[PDB]
Ligand binder design. Structure first.
Ligand code: A1BKE
Ligand code: CL
Length: 167
């Protein structure tokens, strides 16, 4: 039993809700919140910009030190950093950005990072400003993630379409 509330159950391990991931994280304080990161951990907009804003820029400060030490992530890769006031940990995961021409096949590799964590609060990878089809992202999530994932979808219209079209 966990504290996630109001989710629709899609499969044995995948759950979904129309919610602002920032507000959801502040309420649940999950062990892991997933960020929709880029390879530079520049949290400018989308989910990343919102999460970072909610940390009062502490996420960005920590991220800049991470990059200075380690260099950029790979597309499809991840790193674990602090969750600040939102979660114990933040798993920064880089899905392919279609608006940069990146291989959509890397979306499966990106979701594989979730399997290293027993329970996660997450957005749909490569959705939103990353330019991929969110219906496809949900399909890859369900077919790749085996651990317990709670998906927050900000847009109510999109949430209803994802549920109604789910096979
Ligand atoms: C007062 S706060 O600082 O805690 C704070 C905050 F800075 C930002 C947000 N959410 C936002 O910006 C959503 C539009 C951002 C979004 C979410 C999910 C996917 N794509 C975009 C909520 C907060 F509660
Ligand atoms: Cl977004």
């Amino acid at each position: 039993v966990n504290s996630f509330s109001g989710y629709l159950k899609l499969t044995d391990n995948v759950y979904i809700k129309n919610a602002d991931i920032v507000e959801e994280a502040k309420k649940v304080k999950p062990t892991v919140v997933v960020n929709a990161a880029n390879v530079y951990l520049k949290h400018g907009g989308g989910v990343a910009g919102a999460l970072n804003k909610a940390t009062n820029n502490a996420m960005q400060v920590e991220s800049d030190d991470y990059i200075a030490t380690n260099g950029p992530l790979k597309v499809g890769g991840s790193c674990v950093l602090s969750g600040h006031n939102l979660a114990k940990h933040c798993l920064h995961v880089v899905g392919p950005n279609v608006n940069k021409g990146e291989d959509i096949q890397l979306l499966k590799s990106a979701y594989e990072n979730f399997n290293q964590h027993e329970v996660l609060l997450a957005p749909l990878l490569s959705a939103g400003i990353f330019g991929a089809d969110p219906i496809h992202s949900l399909r890859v999530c369900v077919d790749t993630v085996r651990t317990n994932v709670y998906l927050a979808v900000f847009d109510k219209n999109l949430y209803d379409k994802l549920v109604s079209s789910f096979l």
